[PDB]
């Protein structure tokens, strides 16, 4: 269920 | 300057270059759907890959790595753009940097690459990612970063075809024995999903997980406070009990069944469904395993879910009942009858799904054969709740399997 | 010897 690719989100 | 920062990023002045690369990161990380294709088409890729190797300007490395991380967070060809820029060894080299944030971004980027597919996972492994990745696990680590490490571990554990290398799996498992004792929810959910992936990979990998001694730390997570931990743990141990009877028995010896009543009464209905899935795999075993199901008092609950649940859960209950009719003894099917399973089991005969009606016909067939001395009174208790009528109607079905079975059951046991 | 246990992927249509 954990997403395989993940983009980095700005604070 | 606004667009052609492709130029600014190739400046002698490291301030101009760093600002331009930070702007590229800005385009690739502020919004919902980053414009990865224009960035790749713009030729900023080789510049950012060069930036990865600039040990004198860690901020430049960090910005380039996070730009590339977001590029490789995209489509398959978008990830291959980063890979074929031949940057994976550079990230690997960045894993040894004396700056936490550079290590974190290198780990993140590699995780996105590994998560693409089995090919990229094996490639990244082959350049030696696992030992440096696993070294970061330390009691003196930031947690925001430990979570990224565990995420990358999950990506190492994925993609059943071909499964990850045996060497790498037995390298990872000690790290998971440490991480399963942690207190953070994110850490545990990722740890247990890693185990779920491994145990799904196949019986050999299941045996590696068993041999790591981690199953006794896994089973108690079935009745953990958080629902995510519970669902992932149920998935992992269900995958284990898919294997041989002796592997299944390791799970049962960790006293796994004592957790399930709570799972069978959990308000979330997918949890009921998967718990009865687990139980169906247990009743498919030997006689002692059926007896463990019985002695855990799970028989009335399974019959209850068979009676009153939705269709999705009733299917799984039907498998559990039929597999127990296949696997059980004299007194076990007798206990099942003493718990009054026949009426709800018969009422499923009228369902839209062909597999399930076939399953209940199989179970009934074996139940009549199982007790030939009550075969007359069993046929009567079936006919009591309308089961005879539904069987004679399924004798009128369009599927060969169903009507041939219905005719067969009516012939052997209904002299009437 | 039929389908003894039932794998997780089988547990979806």
Numbering used by the authors:
A (entry chain B): 433 to 443
B (entry chain A): 72 to 487
C (entry chain E): 291 to 303
Sentences from the paper on this structure:
Nuclear translocation of the p50/p65 heterodimer is essential for NF-κB signaling. Upon activation, p50/p65 is translocated into the nucleus by the adapter importin α3 and the receptor importin β. In the classical pathway, importin α binds to importin β through its N-terminal Importin-β binding (IBB) domain8,9 and to NLS-cargos through its C-terminal 10 stacked Armadillo motifs (Arms) that collectively form an Arm-core. Importin α possesses two NLS binding pockets located along the concave Arm-core surface: an N-terminal ‘major site’ and C-terminal ‘minor site’ between Arms 2–4 and 6–8, respectively.
The best importin α3 crystals diffracted to 2.10 Å for the p50-NLS complex and 2.85 Å with p65/p50-NLS peptides. In the importin α3 co-crystal structure with the p65- and p50-NLSs, the eleven residue p65-NLS can be divided into two stretches, with the N-terminal residues 301KRKRT305 adopting an extended conformation and the C-terminal residues 306YETFKS311 folding into an α-helix. The residues 303KRTYE307 occupy the P1′-P5′ positions, including the helical conformation contributing to a salt bridge between p65-NLS Glu307 and importin α3 Lys231 within the Arm 4 coiled region. We compared the structures of importin α3 crystallized with different p50- and p65-NLS peptides and found importin α3 adopts a significantly different conformation when the p65-NLS is bound at the minor NLS-box. This shear movement, described as a movement along the plane of an interface, exposes an additional ~93 Å surface area and shifts the C-terminal Arm 10 by ~3.5 Å compared to the apo importin α3 structure. The two chains in the asymmetric unit are nearly identical (RMSD = 1.14 Å), but the dimer is likely a crystallographic artifact due to the high concentration used for crystallization. Both importin α3 molecules in the asymmetric unit are bound to the p50- and p65-NLS peptides, which occupy identical binding sites and have similar structures.
